[PDB]
Coordinates of C-alpha atoms and ligand atoms in Angstrom, one line a residue:
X1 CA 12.8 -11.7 -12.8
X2 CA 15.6 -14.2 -13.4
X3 CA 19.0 -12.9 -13.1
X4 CA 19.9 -13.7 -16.4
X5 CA 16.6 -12.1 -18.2
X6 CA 18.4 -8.6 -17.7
X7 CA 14.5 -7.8 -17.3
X8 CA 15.5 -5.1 -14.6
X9 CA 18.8 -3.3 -16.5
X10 CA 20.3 -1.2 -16.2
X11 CA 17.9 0.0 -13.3
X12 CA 18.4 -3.1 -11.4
X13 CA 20.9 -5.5 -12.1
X14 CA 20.6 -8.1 -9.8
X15 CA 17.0 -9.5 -9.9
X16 CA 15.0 -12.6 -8.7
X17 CA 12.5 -14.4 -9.8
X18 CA 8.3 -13.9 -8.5
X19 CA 7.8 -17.0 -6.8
X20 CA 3.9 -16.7 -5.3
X21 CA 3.5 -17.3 -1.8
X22 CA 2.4 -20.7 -0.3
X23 CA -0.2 -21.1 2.5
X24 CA 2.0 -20.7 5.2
X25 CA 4.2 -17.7 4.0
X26 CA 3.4 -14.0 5.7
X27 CA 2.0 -11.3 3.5
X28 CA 1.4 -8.0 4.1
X29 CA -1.8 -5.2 3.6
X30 CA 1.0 -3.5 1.5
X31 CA 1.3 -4.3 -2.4
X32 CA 5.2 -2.9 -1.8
X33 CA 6.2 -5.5 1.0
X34 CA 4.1 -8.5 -0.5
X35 CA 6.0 -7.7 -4.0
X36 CA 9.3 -7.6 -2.4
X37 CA 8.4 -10.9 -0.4
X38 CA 7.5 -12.4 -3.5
X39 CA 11.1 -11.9 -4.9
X40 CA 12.8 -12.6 -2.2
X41 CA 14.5 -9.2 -1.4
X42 CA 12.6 -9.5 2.0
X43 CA 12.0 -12.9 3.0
X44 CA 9.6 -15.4 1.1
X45 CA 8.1 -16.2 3.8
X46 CA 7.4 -13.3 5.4
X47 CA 9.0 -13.0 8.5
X48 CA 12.0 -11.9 10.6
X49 CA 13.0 -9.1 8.9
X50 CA 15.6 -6.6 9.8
X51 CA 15.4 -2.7 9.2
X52 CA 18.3 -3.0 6.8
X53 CA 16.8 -5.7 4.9
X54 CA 14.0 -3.6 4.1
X55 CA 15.9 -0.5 3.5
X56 CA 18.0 -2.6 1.3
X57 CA 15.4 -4.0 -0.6
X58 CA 13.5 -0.9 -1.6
X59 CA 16.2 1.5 -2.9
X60 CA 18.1 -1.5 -4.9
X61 CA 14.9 -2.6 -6.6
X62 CA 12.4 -0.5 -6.2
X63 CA 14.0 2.9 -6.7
X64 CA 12.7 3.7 -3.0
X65 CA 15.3 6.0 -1.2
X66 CA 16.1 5.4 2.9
X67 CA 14.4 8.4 3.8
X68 CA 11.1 7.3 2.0
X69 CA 10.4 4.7 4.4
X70 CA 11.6 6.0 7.8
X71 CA 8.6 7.0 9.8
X72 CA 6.9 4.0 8.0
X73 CA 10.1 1.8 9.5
X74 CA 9.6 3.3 13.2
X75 CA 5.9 2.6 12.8
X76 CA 6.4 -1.4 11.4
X77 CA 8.2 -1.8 14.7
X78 CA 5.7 -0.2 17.1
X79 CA 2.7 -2.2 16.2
X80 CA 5.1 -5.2 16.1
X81 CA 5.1 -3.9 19.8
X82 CA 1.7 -3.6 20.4
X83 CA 0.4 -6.5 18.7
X84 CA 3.2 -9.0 20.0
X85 CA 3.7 -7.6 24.1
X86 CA 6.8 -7.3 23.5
X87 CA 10.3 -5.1 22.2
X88 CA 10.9 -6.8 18.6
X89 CA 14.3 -5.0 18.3
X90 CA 15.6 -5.3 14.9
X91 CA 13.3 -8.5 14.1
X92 CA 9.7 -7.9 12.6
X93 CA 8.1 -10.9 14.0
X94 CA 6.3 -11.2 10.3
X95 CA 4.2 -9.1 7.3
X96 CA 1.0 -10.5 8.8
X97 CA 0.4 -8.6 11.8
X98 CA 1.2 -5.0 10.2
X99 CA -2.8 -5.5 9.5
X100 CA -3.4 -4.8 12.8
X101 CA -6.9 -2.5 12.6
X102 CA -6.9 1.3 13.4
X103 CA -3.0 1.4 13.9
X104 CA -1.2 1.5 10.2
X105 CA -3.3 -0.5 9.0
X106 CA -6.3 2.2 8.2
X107 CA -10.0 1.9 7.3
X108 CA -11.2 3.4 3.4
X109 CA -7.9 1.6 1.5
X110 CA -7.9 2.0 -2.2
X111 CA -7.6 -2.3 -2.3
X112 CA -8.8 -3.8 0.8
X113 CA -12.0 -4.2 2.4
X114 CA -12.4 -2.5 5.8
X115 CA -12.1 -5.0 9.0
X116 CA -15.8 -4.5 10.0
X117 CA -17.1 -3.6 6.5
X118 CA -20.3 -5.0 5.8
X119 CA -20.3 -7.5 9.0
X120 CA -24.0 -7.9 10.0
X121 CA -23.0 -8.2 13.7
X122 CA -20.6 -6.1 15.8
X123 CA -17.8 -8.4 17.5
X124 CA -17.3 -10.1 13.6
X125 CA -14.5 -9.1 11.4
X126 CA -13.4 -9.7 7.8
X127 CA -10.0 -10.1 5.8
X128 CA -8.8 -6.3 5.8
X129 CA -5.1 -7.6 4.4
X130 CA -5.5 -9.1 1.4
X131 CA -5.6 -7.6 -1.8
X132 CA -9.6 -7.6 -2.9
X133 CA -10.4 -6.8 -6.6
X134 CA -14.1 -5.9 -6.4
X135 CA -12.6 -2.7 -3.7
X136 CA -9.5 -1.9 -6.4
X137 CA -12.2 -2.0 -9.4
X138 CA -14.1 0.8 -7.1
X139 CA -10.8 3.0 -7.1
X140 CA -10.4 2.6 -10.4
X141 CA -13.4 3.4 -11.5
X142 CA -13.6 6.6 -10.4
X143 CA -10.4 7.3 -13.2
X144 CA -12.2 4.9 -16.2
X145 CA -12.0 5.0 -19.4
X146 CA -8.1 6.6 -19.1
X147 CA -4.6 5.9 -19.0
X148 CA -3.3 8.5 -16.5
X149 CA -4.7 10.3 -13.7
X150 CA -3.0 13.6 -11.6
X151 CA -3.4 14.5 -8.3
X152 CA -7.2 16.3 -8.2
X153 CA -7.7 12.8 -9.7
X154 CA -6.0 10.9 -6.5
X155 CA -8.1 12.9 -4.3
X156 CA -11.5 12.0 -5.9
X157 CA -10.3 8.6 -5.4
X158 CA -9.6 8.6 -1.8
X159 CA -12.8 10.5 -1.1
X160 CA -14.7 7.9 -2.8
X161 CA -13.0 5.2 -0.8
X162 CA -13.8 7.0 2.5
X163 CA -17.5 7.5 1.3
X164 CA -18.2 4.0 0.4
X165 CA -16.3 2.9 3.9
X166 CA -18.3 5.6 5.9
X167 CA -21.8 4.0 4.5
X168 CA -20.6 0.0 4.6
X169 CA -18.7 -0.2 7.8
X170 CA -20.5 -1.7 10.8
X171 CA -21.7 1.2 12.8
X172 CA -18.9 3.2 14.8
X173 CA -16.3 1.4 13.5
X174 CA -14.9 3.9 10.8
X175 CA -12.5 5.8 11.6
X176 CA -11.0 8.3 9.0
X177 CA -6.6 8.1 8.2
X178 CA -6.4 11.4 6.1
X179 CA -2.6 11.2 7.3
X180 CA -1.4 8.2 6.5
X181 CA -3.7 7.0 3.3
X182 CA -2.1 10.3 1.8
X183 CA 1.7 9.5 2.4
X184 CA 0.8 6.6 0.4
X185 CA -1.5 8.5 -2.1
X186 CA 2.5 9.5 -2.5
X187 CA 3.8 6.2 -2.4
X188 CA 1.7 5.9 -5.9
X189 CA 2.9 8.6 -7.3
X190 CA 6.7 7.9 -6.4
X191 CA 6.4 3.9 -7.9
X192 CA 4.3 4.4 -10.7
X193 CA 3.6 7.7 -11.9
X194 CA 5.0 8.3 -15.8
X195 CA 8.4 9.3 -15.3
X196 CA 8.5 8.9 -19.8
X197 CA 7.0 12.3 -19.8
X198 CA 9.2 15.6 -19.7
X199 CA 7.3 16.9 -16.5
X200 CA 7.8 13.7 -14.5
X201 CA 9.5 15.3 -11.4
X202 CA 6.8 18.4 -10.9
X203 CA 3.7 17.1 -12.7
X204 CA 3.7 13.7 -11.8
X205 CA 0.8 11.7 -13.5
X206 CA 0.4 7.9 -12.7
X207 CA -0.1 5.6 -15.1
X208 CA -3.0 3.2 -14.6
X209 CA -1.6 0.4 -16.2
X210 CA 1.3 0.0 -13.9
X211 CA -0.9 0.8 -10.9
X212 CA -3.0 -2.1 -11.7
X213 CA -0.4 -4.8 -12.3
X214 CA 1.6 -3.5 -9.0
X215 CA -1.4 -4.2 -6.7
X216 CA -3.1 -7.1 -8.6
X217 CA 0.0 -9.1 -9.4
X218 CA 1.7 -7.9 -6.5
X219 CA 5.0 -7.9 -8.8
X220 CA 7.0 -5.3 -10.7
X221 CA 5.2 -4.0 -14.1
X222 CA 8.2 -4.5 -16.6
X223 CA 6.7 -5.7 -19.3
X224 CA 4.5 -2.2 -19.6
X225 CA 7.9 -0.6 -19.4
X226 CA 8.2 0.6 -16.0
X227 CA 11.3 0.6 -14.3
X228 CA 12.4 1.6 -10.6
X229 CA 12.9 5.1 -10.7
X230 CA 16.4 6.7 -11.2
X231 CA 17.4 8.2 -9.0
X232 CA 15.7 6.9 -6.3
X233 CA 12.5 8.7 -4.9
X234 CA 13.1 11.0 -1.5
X235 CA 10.6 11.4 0.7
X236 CA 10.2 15.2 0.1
X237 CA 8.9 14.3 -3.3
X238 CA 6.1 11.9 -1.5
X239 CA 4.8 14.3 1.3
X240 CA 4.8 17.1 -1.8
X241 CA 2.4 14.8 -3.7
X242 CA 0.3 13.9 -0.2
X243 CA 0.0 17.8 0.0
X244 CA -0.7 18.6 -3.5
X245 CA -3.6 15.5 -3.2
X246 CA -5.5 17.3 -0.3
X247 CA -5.2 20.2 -1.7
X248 CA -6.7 19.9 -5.1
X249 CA -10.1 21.3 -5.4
X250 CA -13.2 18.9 -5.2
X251 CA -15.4 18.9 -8.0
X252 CA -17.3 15.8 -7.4
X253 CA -18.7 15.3 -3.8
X254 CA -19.4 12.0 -2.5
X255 CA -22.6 12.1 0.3
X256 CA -21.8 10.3 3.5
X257 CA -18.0 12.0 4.1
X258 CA -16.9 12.3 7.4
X259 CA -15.8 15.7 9.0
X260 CA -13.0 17.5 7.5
X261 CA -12.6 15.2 4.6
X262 CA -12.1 17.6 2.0
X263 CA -9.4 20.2 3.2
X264 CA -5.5 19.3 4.7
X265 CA -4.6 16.8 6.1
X266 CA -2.5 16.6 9.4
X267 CA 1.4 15.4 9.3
X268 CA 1.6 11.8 9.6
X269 CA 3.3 10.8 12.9
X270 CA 4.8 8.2 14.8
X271 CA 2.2 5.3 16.4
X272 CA 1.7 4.9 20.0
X273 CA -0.4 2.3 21.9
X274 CA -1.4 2.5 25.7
X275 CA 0.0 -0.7 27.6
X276 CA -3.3 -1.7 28.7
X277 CA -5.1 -1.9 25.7
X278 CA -5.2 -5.5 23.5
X279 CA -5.2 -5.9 19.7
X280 CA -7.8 -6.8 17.9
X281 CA -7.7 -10.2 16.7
X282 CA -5.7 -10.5 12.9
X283 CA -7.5 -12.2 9.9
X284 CA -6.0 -15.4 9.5
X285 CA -6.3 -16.0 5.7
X286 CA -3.8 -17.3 3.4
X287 CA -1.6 -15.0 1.4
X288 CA -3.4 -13.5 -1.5
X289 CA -1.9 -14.7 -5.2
X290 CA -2.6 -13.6 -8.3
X291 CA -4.7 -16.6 -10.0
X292 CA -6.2 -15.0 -13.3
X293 CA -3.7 -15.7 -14.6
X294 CA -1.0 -17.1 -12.4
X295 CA 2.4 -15.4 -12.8
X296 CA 5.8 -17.1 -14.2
X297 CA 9.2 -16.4 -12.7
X298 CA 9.8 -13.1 -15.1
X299 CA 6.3 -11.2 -14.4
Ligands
LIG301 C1 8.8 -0.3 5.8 C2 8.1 0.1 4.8 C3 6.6 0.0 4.7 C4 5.7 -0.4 5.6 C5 6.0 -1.0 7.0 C6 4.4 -0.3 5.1 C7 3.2 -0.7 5.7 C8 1.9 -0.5 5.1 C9 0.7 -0.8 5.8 C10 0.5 -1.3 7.2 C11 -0.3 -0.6 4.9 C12 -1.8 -0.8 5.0 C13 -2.6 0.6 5.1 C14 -4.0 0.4 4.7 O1 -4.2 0.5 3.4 O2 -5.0 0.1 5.5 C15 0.3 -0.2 3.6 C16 -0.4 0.2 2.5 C17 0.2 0.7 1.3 N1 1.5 0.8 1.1 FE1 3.1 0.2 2.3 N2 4.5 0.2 3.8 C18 5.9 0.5 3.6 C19 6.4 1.0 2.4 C20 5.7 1.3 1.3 C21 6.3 1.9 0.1 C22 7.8 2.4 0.0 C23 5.4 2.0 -0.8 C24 5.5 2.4 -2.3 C25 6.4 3.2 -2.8 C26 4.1 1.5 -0.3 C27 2.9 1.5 -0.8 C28 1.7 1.3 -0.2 C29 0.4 1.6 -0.8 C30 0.2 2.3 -2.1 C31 -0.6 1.2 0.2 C32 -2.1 1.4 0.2 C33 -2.8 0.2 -0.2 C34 -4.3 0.4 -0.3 O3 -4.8 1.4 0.2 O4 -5.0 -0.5 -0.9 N3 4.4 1.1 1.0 N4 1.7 -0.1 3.8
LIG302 C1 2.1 -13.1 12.5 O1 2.4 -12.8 13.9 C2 1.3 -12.6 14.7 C3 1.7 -12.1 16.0 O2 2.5 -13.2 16.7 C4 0.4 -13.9 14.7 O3 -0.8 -13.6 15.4 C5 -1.0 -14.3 16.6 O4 -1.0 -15.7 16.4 C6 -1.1 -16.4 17.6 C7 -1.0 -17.9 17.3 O5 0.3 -18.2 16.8 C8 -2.4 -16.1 18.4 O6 -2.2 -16.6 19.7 C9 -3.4 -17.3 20.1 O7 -4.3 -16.4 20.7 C10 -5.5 -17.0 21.2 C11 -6.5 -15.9 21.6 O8 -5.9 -15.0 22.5 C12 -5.0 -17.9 22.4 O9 -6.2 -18.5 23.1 C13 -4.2 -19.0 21.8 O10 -3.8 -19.9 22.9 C14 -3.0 -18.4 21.1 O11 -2.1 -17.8 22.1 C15 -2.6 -14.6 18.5 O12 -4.0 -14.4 18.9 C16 -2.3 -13.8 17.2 N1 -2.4 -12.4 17.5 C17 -3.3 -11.6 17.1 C18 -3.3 -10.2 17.6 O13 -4.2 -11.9 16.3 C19 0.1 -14.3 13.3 O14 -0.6 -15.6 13.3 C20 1.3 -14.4 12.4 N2 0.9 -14.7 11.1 C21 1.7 -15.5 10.2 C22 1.0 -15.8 8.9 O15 2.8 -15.9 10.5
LIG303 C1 -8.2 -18.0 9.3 O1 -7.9 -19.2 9.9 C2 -8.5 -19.5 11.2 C3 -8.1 -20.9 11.6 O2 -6.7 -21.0 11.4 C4 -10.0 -19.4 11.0 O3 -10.6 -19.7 12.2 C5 -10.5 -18.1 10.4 O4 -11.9 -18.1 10.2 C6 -9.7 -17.8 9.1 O5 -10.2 -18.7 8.2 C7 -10.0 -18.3 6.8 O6 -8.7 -18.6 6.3 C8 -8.3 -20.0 6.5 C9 -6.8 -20.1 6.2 O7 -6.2 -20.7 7.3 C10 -9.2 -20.8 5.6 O8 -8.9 -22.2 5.9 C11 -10.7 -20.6 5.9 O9 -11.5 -21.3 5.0 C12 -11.0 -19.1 5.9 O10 -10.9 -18.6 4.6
LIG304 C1 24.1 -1.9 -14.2 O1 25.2 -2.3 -14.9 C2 25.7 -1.4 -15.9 C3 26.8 -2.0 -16.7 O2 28.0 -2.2 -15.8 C4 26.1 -0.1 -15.2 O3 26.5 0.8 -16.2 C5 24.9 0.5 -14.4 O4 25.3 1.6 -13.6 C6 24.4 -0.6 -13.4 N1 23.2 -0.1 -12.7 C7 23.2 0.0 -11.4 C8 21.9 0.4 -10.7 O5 24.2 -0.2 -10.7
LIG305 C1 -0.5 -9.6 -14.2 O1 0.7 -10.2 -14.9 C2 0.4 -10.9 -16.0 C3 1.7 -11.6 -16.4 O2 2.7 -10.6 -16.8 C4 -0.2 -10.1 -17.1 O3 -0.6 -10.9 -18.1 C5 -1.5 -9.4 -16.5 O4 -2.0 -8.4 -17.4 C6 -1.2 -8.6 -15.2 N1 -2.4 -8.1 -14.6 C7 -2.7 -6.8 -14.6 C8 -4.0 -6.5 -14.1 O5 -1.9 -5.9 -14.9
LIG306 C1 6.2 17.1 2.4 O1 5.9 17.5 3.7 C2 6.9 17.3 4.6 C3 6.3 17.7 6.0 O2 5.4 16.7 6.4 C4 8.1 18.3 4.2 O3 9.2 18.0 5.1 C5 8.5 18.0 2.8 O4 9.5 18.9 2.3 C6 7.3 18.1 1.8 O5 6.8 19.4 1.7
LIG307 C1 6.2 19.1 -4.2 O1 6.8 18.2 -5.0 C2 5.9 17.5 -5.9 C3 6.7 16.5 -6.7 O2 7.8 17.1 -7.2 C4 5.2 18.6 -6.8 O3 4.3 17.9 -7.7 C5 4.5 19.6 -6.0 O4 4.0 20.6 -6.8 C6 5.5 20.2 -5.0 O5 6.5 21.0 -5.6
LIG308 C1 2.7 19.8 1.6 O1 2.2 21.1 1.3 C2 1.3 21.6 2.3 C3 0.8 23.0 1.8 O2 1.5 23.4 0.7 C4 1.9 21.7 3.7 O3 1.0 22.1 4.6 C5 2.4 20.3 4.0 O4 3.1 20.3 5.3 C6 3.4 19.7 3.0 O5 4.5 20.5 2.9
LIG309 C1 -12.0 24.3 -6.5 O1 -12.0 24.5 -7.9 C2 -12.9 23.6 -8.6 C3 -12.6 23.8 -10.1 O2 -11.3 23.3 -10.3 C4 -14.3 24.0 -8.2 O3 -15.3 23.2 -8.8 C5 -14.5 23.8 -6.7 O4 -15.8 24.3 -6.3 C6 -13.4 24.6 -5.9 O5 -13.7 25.9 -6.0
LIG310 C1 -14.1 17.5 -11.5 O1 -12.7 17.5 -11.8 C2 -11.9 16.6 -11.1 C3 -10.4 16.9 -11.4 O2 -10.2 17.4 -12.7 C4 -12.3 15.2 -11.5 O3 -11.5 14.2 -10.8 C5 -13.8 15.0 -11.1 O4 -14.2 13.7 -11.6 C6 -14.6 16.1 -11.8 O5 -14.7 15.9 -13.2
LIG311 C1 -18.8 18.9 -3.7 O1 -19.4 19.6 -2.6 C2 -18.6 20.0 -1.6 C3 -19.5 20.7 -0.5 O2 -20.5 19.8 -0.1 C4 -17.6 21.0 -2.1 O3 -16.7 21.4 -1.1 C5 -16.8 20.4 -3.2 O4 -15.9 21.3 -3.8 C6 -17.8 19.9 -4.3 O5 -18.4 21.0 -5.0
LIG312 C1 -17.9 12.6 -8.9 O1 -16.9 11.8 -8.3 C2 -17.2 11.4 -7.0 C3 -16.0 10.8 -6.3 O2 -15.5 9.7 -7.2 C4 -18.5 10.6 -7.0 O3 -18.9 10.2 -5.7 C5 -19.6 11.3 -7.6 O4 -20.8 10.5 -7.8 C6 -19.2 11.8 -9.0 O5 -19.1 10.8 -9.9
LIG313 C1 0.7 13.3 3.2 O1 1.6 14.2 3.6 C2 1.1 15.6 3.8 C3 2.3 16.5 4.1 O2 2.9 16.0 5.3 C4 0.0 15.6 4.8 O3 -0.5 16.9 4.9 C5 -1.1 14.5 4.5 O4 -2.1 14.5 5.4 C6 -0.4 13.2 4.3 O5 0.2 12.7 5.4
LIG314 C1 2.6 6.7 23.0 O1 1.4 7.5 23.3 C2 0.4 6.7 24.0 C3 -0.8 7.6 24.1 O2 -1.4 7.9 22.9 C4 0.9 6.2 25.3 O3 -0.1 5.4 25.9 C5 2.1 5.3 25.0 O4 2.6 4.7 26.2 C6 3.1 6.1 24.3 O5 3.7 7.1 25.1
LIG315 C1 -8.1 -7.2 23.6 O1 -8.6 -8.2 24.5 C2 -9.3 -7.8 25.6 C3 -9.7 -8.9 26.5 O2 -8.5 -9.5 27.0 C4 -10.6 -7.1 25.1 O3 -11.4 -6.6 26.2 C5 -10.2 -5.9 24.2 O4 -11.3 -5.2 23.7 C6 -9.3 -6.4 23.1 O5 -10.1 -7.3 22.3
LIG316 C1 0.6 -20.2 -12.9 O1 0.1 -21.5 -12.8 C2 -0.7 -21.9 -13.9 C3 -1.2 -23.3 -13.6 O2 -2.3 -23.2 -12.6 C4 0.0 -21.8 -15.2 O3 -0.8 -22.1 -16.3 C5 0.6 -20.5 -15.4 O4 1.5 -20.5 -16.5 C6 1.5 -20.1 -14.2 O5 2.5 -21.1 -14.1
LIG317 MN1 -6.9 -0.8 5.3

């Protein structure tokens, strides 16, 4: 928000204004970067951004510890690697190219279409970055009707989003991310879960409302009350809620899961990709804005 609103205090107290990106900006397949680029506590536009920068960003306005966003960090830096040919020291070339397919970027999100979902022919890809409203409204469906959801909830989600992926994709291109999808099945539950209730820190239950502002708005949810969490989240809480996510039992089965899906999932770890290999092609589309309605410099 503007500076002057005092929108963000006493959580944050030095905010800027949501200013939507413009055709040529960089945005992200992550509703946390493309909110912070949106602000300007990353670059508008997108790219050349420093490690620091981003630590910066999320624990002064997003109540996002250092330790939260480490492996995610080291990760950033080796597709930026893989997809460029080259070292990109302490530079991410830009947002754009983080949705490089079966790397982080992962098939069954909870708000973006798959890169081969529903293409009628095999070399044919689709815009797997930007945020898509009919795939959120298929997430959120699964919790309707409420205003909170817990973590046998979460899981019912994500298995959902892995059976509709597994039956729409083009033939052999699926390819299941237990590991990472659940660090940020955490990443939910850290931003937006209801820290208002006494329980907050062991129970945590998200609150829908947030969640959907945060990923369609690709802002901050103030004005339903949020705030960045105080203290700032560690990442101990986030691989506790991944855990506790997996391991909640299963009392709706979606047909069409791939092997293991229900059960643990293994430790996420850091990236690698052989020298010889060449990345797929990135969708080219222009940043994603909210548009129904457009936002104002204080949403
Ligand atoms: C340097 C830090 C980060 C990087 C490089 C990063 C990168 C990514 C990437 C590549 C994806 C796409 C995965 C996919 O859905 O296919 C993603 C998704 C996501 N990220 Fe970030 N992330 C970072 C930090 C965070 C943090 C701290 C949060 C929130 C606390 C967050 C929340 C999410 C969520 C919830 C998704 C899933 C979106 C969906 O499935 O529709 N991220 N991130
Ligand atoms: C974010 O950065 C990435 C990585 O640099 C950008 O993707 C790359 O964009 C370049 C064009 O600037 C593409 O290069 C072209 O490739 C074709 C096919 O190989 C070649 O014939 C052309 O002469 C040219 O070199 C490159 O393919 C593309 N990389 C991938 C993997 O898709 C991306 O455009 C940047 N996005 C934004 C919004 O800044
Ligand atoms: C991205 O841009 C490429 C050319 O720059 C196209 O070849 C791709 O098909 C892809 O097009 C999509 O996004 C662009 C934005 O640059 C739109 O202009 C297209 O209409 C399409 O949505
Ligand atoms: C915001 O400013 C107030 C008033 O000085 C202060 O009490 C509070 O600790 C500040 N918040 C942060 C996150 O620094
Ligand atoms: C997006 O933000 C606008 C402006 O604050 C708000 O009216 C709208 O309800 C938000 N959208 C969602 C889905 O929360
Ligand atoms: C989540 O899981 C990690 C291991 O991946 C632990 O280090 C953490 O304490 C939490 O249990
Ligand atoms: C790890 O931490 C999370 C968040 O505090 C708990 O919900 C979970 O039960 C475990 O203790
Ligand atoms: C979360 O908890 C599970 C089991 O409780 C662990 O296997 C995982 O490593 C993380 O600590
Ligand atoms: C785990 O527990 C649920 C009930 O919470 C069962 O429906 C499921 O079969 C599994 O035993
Ligand atoms: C069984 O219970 C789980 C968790 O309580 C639900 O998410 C599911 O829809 C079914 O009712
Ligand atoms: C749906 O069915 C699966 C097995 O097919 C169970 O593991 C799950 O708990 C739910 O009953
Ligand atoms: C229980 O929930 C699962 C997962 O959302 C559905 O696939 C199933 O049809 C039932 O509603
Ligand atoms: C979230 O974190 C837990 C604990 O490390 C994993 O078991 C899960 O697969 C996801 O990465
Ligand atoms: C990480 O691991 C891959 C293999 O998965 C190697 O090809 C790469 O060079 C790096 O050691
Ligand atoms: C990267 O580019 C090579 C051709 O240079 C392909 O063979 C490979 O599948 C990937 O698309
Ligand atoms: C976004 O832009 C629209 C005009 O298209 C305004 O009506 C709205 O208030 C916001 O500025
Ligand atoms: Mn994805």
């Amino acid at each position: 928000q503007e500076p002057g609103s005092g929108i963000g205090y006493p959580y944050d107290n030095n905010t800027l204004p949501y200013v939507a990106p413009g055709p040529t900006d960089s945005r992200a397949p992550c509703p946390a970067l493309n909110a912070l680029a949106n602000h300007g506590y990353i670059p508008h536009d997108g790219r050349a951004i420093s490690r620091e920068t981003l630590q910066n960003a999320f624990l002064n306005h997003m109540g996002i510890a250092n330790s939260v966003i480490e492996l995610a960090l080291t990760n950033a830096f080796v597709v930026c690697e893989y997809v460029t040919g080259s070292d990109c020291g302490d530079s991410l070339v830009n947002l754009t190219l983080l949705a490089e397919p079966h790397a982080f970027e992962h098939d069954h999100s909870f708000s973006r279409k798959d890169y081969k979902q529903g293409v009628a022919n095999s070399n044919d890809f689709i815009d797997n970055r930007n945020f898509d409203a009919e795939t959120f409204q298929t997430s959120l469906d699964v919790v309707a009707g409420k205003t909170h959801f817990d973590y046998a909830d979460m899981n019912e989600i994500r298995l959902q989003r892995e059976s509709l992926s597994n039956e729409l994709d083009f033939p052999g291109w699926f390819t299941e991310s237990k590991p990472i999808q659940n660090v940020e099945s955490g990443f939910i539950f850290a931003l937006v879960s209801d820290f208002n209730l006494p329980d907050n820190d062991e129970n945590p239950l998200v609150r829908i409302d947030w969640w959907k502002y945060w990923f369609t708005n690709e802002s901050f949810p103030y004005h339903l009350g949020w705030h960045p969490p105080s203290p700032a989240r560690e990442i101990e809480f986030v691989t506790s809620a991944s855990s506790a996510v997996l391991a909640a039992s299963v009392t709706s089965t979606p047909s069409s899961l791939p092997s293991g899906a229900i059960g643990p999932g293994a430790e996420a770890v850091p990236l690698s990709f052989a020298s010889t290999m060449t990345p797929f092609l990135l969708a080219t589309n222009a940043p994603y804005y909210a548009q129904d309605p457009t936002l104002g410099p204080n949403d």
